[PDB]
Design a protein around this ligand. Structure first.
Ligand code: HEM
Length: 151
C-alpha cells in the first residue's frame, strides 16, 4: 500500500514522462533490450533489430513505447485501484506473449534507469522510493494473476 504522499510523488514523476511519452518509452524498451537480450526475443515485431542505432531509428519502436506507457500511466493514476486495467495485461502477457514475471522486474529497472538518465538532479530520492513501490505493487498484482493461470 502506498501513502497519499507516495502516490503524489509517483504522479509528479509521471508528469516528466508525459512531456515526451514516445522518447521515454523508446528509451525504456531500448535499455530493456540491450541489458536483457532475451526480452527482445519475445517480440516478433522487433527481433530484426540488431544494433542500438536500428532501435533508435525504429519509428515502430517509438509507437510500442507510446502503447506501453499509455497503459502504465493510466494504471498508476488508479493509485492501486487497477484490477480492471491489469486483468487483460496479465492474460496477454502470461498466456499469449509468454513473458515471465522476471521480465517485468527488468522493465521496472529500465524505467528507473531511464528516469535517472533523462532527469539528472531532478529525480529525487523520495520519488525513486515511491516509484519503486508503485512498480512493486504492479508486479505483485500481475504476479497473482499469473499464479492463478499456472505461470
Ligand atoms: C510495464 C509493463 C508492461 C506494460 C504496461 C505492457 C503493456 C503492453 C500493452 C498495452 C500491449 C498491447 C496489448 C496487449 O497485448 O496486451 C503490449 C504488448 C506486448 N507486450 Fe507488453 N507491457 C509490459 C511489459 C512487457 C514486457 C516486459 C515484455 C517483454 C519482455 C512485453 C512484451 C509484449 C509483447 C511481445 C507484446 C505484443 C507486441 C506486438 O507484437 O505488437 N511486455 N504490452
Amino acid at each position: 500500500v502506498l501513502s497519499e504522499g507516495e502516490w503524489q510523488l509517483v504522479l509528479h514523476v509521471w508528469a516528466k514522462v508525459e512531456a515526451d511519452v514516445a522518447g521515454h518509452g523508446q528509451d525504456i524498451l531500448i535499455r530493456l533490450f540491450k541489458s536483457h537480450p532475451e526480452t527482445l526475443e519475445k517480440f516478433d515485431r522487433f527481433k530484426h533489430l540488431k544494433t542500438e542505432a536500428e532501435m533508435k531509428a525504429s519509428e515502430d519502436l517509438k509507437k510500442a513505447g507510446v502503447t506501453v506507457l499509455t497503459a502504465l500511466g493510466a494504471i498508476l493514476k488508479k493509485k492501486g485501484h487497477h484490477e480492471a486495467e491489469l486483468k487483460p495485461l496479465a492474460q496477454s502477457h502470461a498466456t499469449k506473449h509468454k513473458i515471465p514475471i522476471k521480465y517485468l522486474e527488468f522493465i521496472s529497472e529500465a524505467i528507473i534507469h531511464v528516469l535517472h538518465s533523462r532527469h539528472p538532479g531532478n529525480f529525487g530520492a523520495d520519488a525513486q522510493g515511491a516509484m519503486n513501490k508503485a512498480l512493486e505493487l504492479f508486479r505483485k498484482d500481475i504476479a497473482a494473476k499469473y499464479k492463478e493461470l499456472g505461470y
